[PDB]
Amino acid sequence: SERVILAYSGGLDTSVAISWIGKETGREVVAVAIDLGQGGEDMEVVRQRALDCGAVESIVIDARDEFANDYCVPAIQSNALYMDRYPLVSALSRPLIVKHLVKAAREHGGTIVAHGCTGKGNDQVRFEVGFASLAPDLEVLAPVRDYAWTREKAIAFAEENNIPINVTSPFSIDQNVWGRAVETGFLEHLWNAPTKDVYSYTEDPTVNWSTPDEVIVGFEQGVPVSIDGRSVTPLQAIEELNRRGGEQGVGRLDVVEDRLVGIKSREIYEAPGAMVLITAHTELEHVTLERELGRFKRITDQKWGELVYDGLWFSPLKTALESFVAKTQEHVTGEIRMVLHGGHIAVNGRRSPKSLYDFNLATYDEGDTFDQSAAKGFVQIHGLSSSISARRDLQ
Amino acid sequence: SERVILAYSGGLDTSVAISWIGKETGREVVAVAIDLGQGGEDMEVVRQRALDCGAVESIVIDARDEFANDYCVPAIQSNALYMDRYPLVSALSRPLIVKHLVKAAREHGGTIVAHGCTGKGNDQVRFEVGFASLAPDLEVLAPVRDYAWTREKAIAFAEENNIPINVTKRSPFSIDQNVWGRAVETGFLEHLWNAPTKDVYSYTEDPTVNWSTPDEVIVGFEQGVPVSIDGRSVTPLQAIEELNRRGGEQGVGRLDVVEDRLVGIKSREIYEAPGAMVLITAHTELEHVTLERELGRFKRITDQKWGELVYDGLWFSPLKTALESFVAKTQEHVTGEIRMVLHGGHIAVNGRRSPKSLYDFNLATYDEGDTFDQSAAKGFVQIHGLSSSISARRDLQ
Amino acid sequence: SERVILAYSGGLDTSVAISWIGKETGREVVAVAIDLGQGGEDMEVVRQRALDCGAVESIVIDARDEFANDYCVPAIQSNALYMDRYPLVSALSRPLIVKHLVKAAREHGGTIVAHGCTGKGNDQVRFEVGFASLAPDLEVLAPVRDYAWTREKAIAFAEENNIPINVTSPFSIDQNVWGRAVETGFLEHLWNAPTKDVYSYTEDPTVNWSTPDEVIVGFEQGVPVSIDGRSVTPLQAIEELNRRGGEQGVGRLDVVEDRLVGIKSREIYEAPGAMVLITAHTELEHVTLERELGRFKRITDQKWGELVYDGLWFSPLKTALESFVAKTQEHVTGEIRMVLHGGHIAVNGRRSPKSLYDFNLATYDEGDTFDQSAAKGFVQIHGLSSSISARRDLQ
Amino acid sequence: SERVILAYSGGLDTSVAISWIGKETGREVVAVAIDLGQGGEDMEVVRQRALDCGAVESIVIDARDEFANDYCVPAIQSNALYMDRYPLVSALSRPLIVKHLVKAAREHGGTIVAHGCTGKGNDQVRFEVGFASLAPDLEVLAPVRDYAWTREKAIAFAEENNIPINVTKRSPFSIDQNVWGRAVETGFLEHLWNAPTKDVYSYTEDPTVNWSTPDEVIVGFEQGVPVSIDGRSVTPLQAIEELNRRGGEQGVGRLDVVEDRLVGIKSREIYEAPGAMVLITAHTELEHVTLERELGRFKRITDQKWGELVYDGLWFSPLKTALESFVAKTQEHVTGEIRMVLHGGHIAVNGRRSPKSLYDFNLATYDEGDTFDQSAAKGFVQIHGLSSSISARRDLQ
């Protein structure tokens, strides 16, 4: 029916965009809001807002389990830490939102999709490269980037058209079950430290002095499946570790990162459950993956994180890396014990039915099975090519 | 006089090895003890012990500053973390010991060098590849690996040959320590479900002890070298020692790692490296402010490779040497200060400043001073996504 | 029955080894000879020789198709060129020989396997790492390396025990359907050029002046499946291109390579079919694989070739790379036209039903669909981070 | 005087662009023509044409040696082959043109630089990223991409404004050539099942022509720089030109490539680069003789990355610059001679010699002089294979 399908968050800009897009294009607007565990307002209140702001149809998709299962678990399996710091909090959800917006377009006669991203962020890239890969036939509208859009203009438009919207905190927040990101003007200066007011997912790391939390996280083929012996879904694992890590101030990040669009920016993140899961998963790989496979997998972990940050979730390199990763995870099964305390994650135990750790090869005790007679010859040949090079250097 | 040059630590085993090597080879032994900040017994007491055990010469080399400057600083510049966990505590010192043992051989007429490493560790590799690179003419003697030299054989030899040595009780800990960090291996910790207890720690206090007084510290670098702490100029050795103290008081740098040995097996070790972890963390944060994006992405690859080379006994290899040329160029503008809070066993960055910053407030900000030209973005996104879009179209066709 | 299973090539050393191993160990010997297309003597003549030299059982395994399908085709799919020169001629067959020797051990009550490799080559590594991965319970005997073995000693042993064996050319040859390797004393000097006598698989590149051979090689999901429109099996593809490439002197290689055991050595190879197949497969990937996937796949191609050279065919990194490769090959389907002439392979045509080449995006003709309005903005942001770095450098 | 500095090739389009830019901007134009060995019209004829078309100044820079020394030699040292096919013919010259255009701007009071690249090629990127790095104060004008400047608009403008220019017939070939190689694009070859015909070639003869007389050539390097041919000393430019001639006579360096443009599309191009391919082939062979194994493995990674950076318009990027520091160290011992036969369009190596060789005859040989200690091999194999053996055991358990 030649609709515009709007990725709808419930905020001022996308709410005004509904009738603004209607006027600019002459088309009806279907609002699509995704529950990723962002909390705050009930999703029905968001759904209703889009209707009151002129959407012909307004839908909520509960994608929390899908987000955990199909986006967060892959990030865990590639130990994804952008800059070796950031578990891709905002980046991971964008391809999922894209997927559902395309699906909604097929269902509701949409020929255009729209998003409210700005022109100096990464999110525009993640949305628009995604749309171009999944549905190039759809026109993509970026009203906030491409149409001389300002808050004042949006508010003036809302006033002129009696749009029922709240137009009344200096924090720019993005949160979901995987983590929370905070931008504020004060923190754009790199010598300014964050204050307690920036935080929500986590308690101050000083709170629980005599009550550390020791937790055991179990994985089966790279997927988190248990906490302290209790079976859990991936969403439940993330939520429980968000709570337990958050109570210990774990996962507070303060990062200067390279945006794909050419600039550095400073951001604050809270990602307690994510950091516990990625740390544990890494420790389990050290127990279950052979040396040279592990060395190379640190390269593919890094590449994967870059691809997803760079808006290339749907790229063929990312997809092929997933086939590599799936094979590596076959035996990544076992339990990792960590103490959560003081904002810190401290591993102190591992066990695995797929362990490559061999006590008898490692021990000096009576059970020692390592044949040391091999070592002299190994060292001689291991060192030979660089020895020959050194001789030449010195000649 | 065709001497044996012994890498001498002062321990019972290598002490009795001096006398034993003398009888078994008929050669004179020169003991060389290197001060790397291992503490323990005074070096002169160590030096004398070798003499009393039959060494014809016994020397001590104070290499603490050389170690910090020429080994620890390179590790900082490559953010060296083996397994992404371990800043190479025991690995770093080995090439420096090799260098000095070779120098001692040339000066004291040595034709044989000896070490006390075992046959299932990495240190044998680091020593012997080093010797093969720096001085292939020297024969290498490894009594522990190749001639079954044990504590028992040593205690027995010293009693049978009336060697004036005091036999110390056996420790449950296998410990290697220097100014850069401390490594602990115990039988109990060979079981991966056993957690360490407080008795394995020495360099660091439990995080709970000084919990009430978090320590905010500023570390300054110039061209990738640590040069100041809280505004005070320091040498690299002083930087390491001060941050060992301050991080140690906060329980920072406690590591518990299952690592891949080059000799094909996994093993579990405890490390304490408070100063090293503060320096490497701060250095990494400073590179995020001062190195361009794609240079940074590739340097994480070379950082990893460098750590592997040094772990694998390849400090002197031509790839390691060539990576150092790459690293030196990258460090030219790695100058600035990083502010961190040490608390709870954790290092928390909360500030950066740099006269070489690539951060541009006006390009990043949303305030009135915003200079970012957003008109470029639509086109950038179209072309950045185009090759994968074409691939997707083919996939779906 | 506590047998030794010998990897049996039919030569002097392994023939004498049969009764020598029998005396040294007191065990019966099962000889296992693999047909990899090495030609020369009929395989039955080889089988019979082992019996006459004292083997209790002697078997021939015809593994030519298996070698092509399961070892050569993976090498094609990773464009495997060691040193960017050598398509792993001798390296590829070793894991296959290992596989069949282990199988024979299970069938014939073998507790020991034996091979005739020397101590300064790569082949000992490929055999023994393979045995250690597939069957660590088997003792591995290396009589030629570990038992003070010399040709004179072997001949003296044969004389003393009346072993019926030929004990009478200075070439050290290893050949199979994938290629031919030649070692000779004269060529151990790097300023010595090879003479015509070193060659067998290929004609001199000067022969066919006015009769070049244009060939079309077709692939389906990375597997060679046609030549000049004719369907072929992978073995048939290799054999036909060996012939056609060989007639044009294609695939003559002269390489200084790094052995895993620490030394450089000089070797001559003939690999006409292999080089045609790998060249064509590479050209087809340039047509069918997206840019950044191709850039990364050149890294995995190199790593794969190193792993196989280094005796790590069965390693978990190699196996995981195969999962990566399998995904990349999904659309590597199409035909590559090349001229074979003068020792050279010259591509001059491609076609593919899975092509990523878009004529209309590339052309300047009337059909041009490239939107150039995007380019200014792309260049501005692509260049921004290094521009900012340059500004800092210059300040 | 707020001049426009025009990267001037001498072609019809940019010639009329001079006059057109003058009227459209009211600014004076300075034309800068760079001699990179493109041949064709005499540079002074080119220089004069710009003046006749209204340029206030017209200069010619002979950059042939600078190009060989500072751009082609780095490409040789990184064995630069884009797609593992293309030695960057057109990509290499762009940063050198940028440098000279910036220098000309400073000298002649230019505030604007202009180029004639299109919006779907790589050259726009190489020019504009270059300008943004070297001289961000300069405005960049791109008439072809941004102001619809075409041949037709040029032929029309020159007739309407009485411009004293001779209008040459359109070529079916889009050609870019310099001393390093030649690139040809034709409509016919935009179809991937069309083979090139003899008329697309110029730098090289058909391989059949001189088939009866194969050319054996020795190329010598010193620290990775080509310095001799058949014993005769040469400059890098002389090396390139001589091997262009000798390889060209044998049909060497004919390339036909489907490549990935940075702007997201594939395209098909023909190249002729006889001298470049001989030099890069020889340089690679020499590294196999003079660089240690693991250094060589990693350098194939940096070789690939360097070629990508330069293709992608990132010659001036800090990763490229840092890789150059890595490369310089690797080249220290890349000294020696490589003997090849040029014939049949093919380059066939058949000899190497080097005073810095890592080849050791006695370690390799099976003759009586054999020095390889085989007793080390069994142990090496046991430990080399151990981690994958343990993994296999777990897999099978």
Ligand SMILES: Nc1ncnc2c1ncn2[C@@H]1O[C@H](COP(=O)(O)OP(=O)(O)NP(=O)(O)O)[C@@H](O)[C@H]1O
């Ligand atoms: N949960 C969601 N469901 C649907 N669309 C979403 C969701 N989250 C984000 N988006 C889309 O992503 C765009 C960018 O997200 P964001 O950076 O959160 O901007 P916003 O929500 O529009 N403004 P703000 O109130 O500042 O967060 C939004 O404009 C929406 O179009």
Ligand SMILES: Nc1ncnc2c1ncn2[C@@H]1O[C@H](COP(=O)(O)OP(=O)(O)NP(=O)(O)O)[C@@H](O)[C@H]1O
């Ligand atoms: N500071 C040093 N100066 C000289 N040689 C050293 C030094 N530290 C270690 N070595 C050498 O390295 C070998 C292995 O180190 P280590 O594992 O510390 O052995 P050890 O000291 O002999 N045994 P232990 O008493 O248990 O520490 C020693 O046997 C010495 O040969």
Ligand SMILES: Nc1ncnc2c1ncn2[C@@H]1O[C@H](COP(=O)(O)OP(=O)(O)NP(=O)(O)O)[C@@H](O)[C@H]1O
């Ligand atoms: N086709 C095969 N079937 C079985 N075993 C084989 C085969 N090819 C090689 N081998 C084994 O691989 C070992 C090394 O191969 P090679 O280098 O060919 O040595 P050889 O054949 O024993 N001596 P030579 O006559 O010089 O080739 C041989 O000794 C055999 O044990």
Ligand SMILES: Nc1ncnc2c1ncn2[C@@H]1O[C@H](COP(=O)(O)OP(=O)(O)NP(=O)(O)O)[C@@H](O)[C@H]1O
């Ligand atoms: N030798 C040179 N000296 C100066 N500027 C150059 C030179 N070669 C190329 N350029 C610049 O690079 C741009 C693109 O190169 P090219 O593709 O050769 O364009 P053209 O020469 O204008 N068109 P054509 O006549 O078809 O070759 C040219 O328009 C000039 O601006």
Ligand SMILES: NC(=[NH2+])NCCC[C@H](N)C(=O)O
């Ligand atoms: N505060 C925010 N809204 N941040 C959104 C982006 C977060 C992070 N910089 C990313 O690119 O993924």
Ligand SMILES: NC(=[NH2+])NCCC[C@H](N)C(=O)O
């Ligand atoms: N406890 C010890 N002595 N450890 C020494 C070795 C430490 C560490 N595993 C290394 O290889 O460098």
Ligand SMILES: NC(=[NH2+])NCCC[C@H](N)C(=O)O
């Ligand atoms: N002439 C030979 N037998 N060569 C066998 C080995 C060939 C090659 N150097 C490899 O390691 O694979």
Ligand SMILES: NC(=[NH2+])NCCC[C@H](N)C(=O)O
């Ligand atoms: N025919 C041409 N003018 N080609 C110029 C570009 C050549 C090559 N594709 C490059 O990007 O460097």
Ligand SMILES: [Mg+2]
């Ligand atoms: Mg929002």
Ligand SMILES: [Mg+2]
């Ligand atoms: Mg990493």
Ligand SMILES: [Mg+2]
């Ligand atoms: Mg010690």
Ligand SMILES: [Mg+2]
């Ligand atoms: Mg043979």
Ligand SMILES: [Mg+2]
């Ligand atoms: Mg390669």
Ligand SMILES: [Mg+2]
């Ligand atoms: Mg031109």
